[PDB]
Amino acid sequence: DRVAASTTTNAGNLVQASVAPTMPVKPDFKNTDDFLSMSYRSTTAPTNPTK
Amino acid sequence: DRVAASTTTNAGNLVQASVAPTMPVKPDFKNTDDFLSMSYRSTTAPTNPTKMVHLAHGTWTTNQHRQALVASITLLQAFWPNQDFPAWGQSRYFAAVRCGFHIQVQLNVNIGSAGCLIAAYMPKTAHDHMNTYTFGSYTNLPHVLMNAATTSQADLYIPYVFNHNYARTDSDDLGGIYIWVWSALTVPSGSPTTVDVTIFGSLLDLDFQCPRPPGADTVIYT
Amino acid sequence: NVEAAQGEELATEVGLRATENDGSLSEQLNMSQPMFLNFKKHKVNIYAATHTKVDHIFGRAWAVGVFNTETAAIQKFDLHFPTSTHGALSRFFCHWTGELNIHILNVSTTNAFLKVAHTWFGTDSGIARTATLESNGTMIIPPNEQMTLCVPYYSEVPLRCVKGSDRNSAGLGSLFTQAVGRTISNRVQIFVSFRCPNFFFPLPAPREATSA
Numbered sequence: 001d002r003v004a005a006s007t008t009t010n011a012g013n014l015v016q017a018s019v020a021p022t023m024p025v026k027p028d029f030k031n032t033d034d035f036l037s038m039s040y041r042s043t044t045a046p047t048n049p050t051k
Numbered sequence: 052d053r054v055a056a057s058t059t060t061n062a063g064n065l066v067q068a069s070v071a072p073t074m075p076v077k078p079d080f081k082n083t084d085d086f087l088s089m090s091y092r093s094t095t096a097p098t099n100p101t102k103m104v105h106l107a108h109g110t111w112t113t114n115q116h117r118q119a120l121v122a123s124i125t126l127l128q129a130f131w132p133n134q135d136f137p138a139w140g141q142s143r144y145f146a147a148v149r150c151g152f153h154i155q156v157q158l159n160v161n162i163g164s165a166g167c168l169i170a171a172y173m174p175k176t177a178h179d180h181m182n183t184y185t186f187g188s189y190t191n192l193p194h195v196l197m198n199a200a201t202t203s204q205a206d207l208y209i210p211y212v213f214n215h216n217y218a219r220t221d222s223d224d225l226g227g228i229y230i231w232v233w234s235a236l237t238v239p240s241g242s243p244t245t246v247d248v249t250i251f252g253s254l255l256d257l258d259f260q261c262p263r264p265p266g267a268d269t270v271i272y273t
Numbered sequence: 274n275v276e277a278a279q280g281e282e283l284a285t286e287v288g289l290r291a292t293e294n295d296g297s298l299s300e301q302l303n304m305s306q307p308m309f310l311n312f313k314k315h316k317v318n319i320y321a322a323t324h325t326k327v328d329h330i331f332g333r334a335w336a337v338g339v340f341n342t343e344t345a346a347i348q349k350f351d352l353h354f355p356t357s358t359h360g361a362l363s364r365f366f367c368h369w370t371g372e373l374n375i376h377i378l379n380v381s382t383t384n385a386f387l388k389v390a391h392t393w394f395g396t397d398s399g400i401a402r403t404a405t406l407e408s409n410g411t412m413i414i415p416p417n418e419q420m421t422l423c424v425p426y427y428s429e430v431p432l433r434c435v436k437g438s439d440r441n442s443a444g445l446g447s448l449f450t451q452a453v454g455r456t457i458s459n460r461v462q463i464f465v466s467f468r469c470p471n472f473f474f475p476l477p478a479p480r481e482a483t484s485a
Binding site: 174176177179180182183184185186188189190191192193194195196197198201202212214215216272273 | 292293295298365367368429430431432433434436437441442443473474475476477478479480482
């Protein structure tokens, strides 16, 4: 039950009386999908406006 | 005067009878600006859609009994229902989402009130039917209990969980967080009756794929 | 002395716990349950094997559907996940992937061969693929006899969800059969047993439906 801060890009979050987070059993947070259902490179989205 | 090809992201250009390129005298193509006119980090722009945003507040009063629903959020359609949200503009192109989710339930209770709301997570194919589930068992879900007293915030991380490999942006496919009344609140007089609940969300592990015309829907998995 | 015990640090062990901080739900699995001066926690295995283990429990098959077939026309028979049996223990999980056995049992008064074929996609793949079932994995079953043939997992959806009834991705399959040898009253009974199932993610315990 302590001070927990959270910051992403511009936004930020300063919380008091925090609670420890939860996650589903045996979580795997690796972003990419192997095997791949898409041949594209995952850096496509931010790169896209350069097209 | 030979064959020159050019490729950027998706687009590509195959030219014949090319001419050697030109550039202004003493060019310097280094992107960043030193000295800096902006304190921000140059990786801001692509990172920006990950920014955490206010999501679907709700009002939880005395009158509502147990098993009642305080507020509802449809997860994947939640981060860009409007044009105002930061992740909207860049999600209005790419049609698929592999993204993970970070949602922090904000709550404030005037000291001297007692009761609990539960923040759960129901995937779409689960959400199709409420009628099947016993209420007393909802704690099987990934969740966090929230006590009235001595809980400021409830932090829960949700990995991507869905049938199909990729999920459609414009739809509800990821399901959504639903917040239920675990026990009625108890208010002494005088106190403000309505206890406001705001689900303050976020997003992480950003991904997009499969280009489409800006406004049109497209089927992928079905 | 012998009888009494005291705090103040280990009151966690004597059972006082804050539910507001649960850590992960799986973090509670690690939690040591409270104990008083006298309790003996000992894991006593009466049987060598464990009936609790996922692998073993769904080994026992369960009966879904019975129908007589007097007609050589191809029979559409759809397989829902189990209800009203020990198979309903699988109702805790949405996402499921694994190969599954099918025990069909042929009963023929007049001698008849009967054929079995399985398709994860339904009757309609967008074309009618049911024209002849010979090429899709047919396995022929002799009269008054039964076989254990198991179906591999072929699906455009990597994870089947148990709950939903939606024919596309929800069911665990759709089963095709036809009799041969000019007969009638050929009666079958079909049993479905999983093999090394993989169940992903839990759900709350489902309500018993009196009204259906």
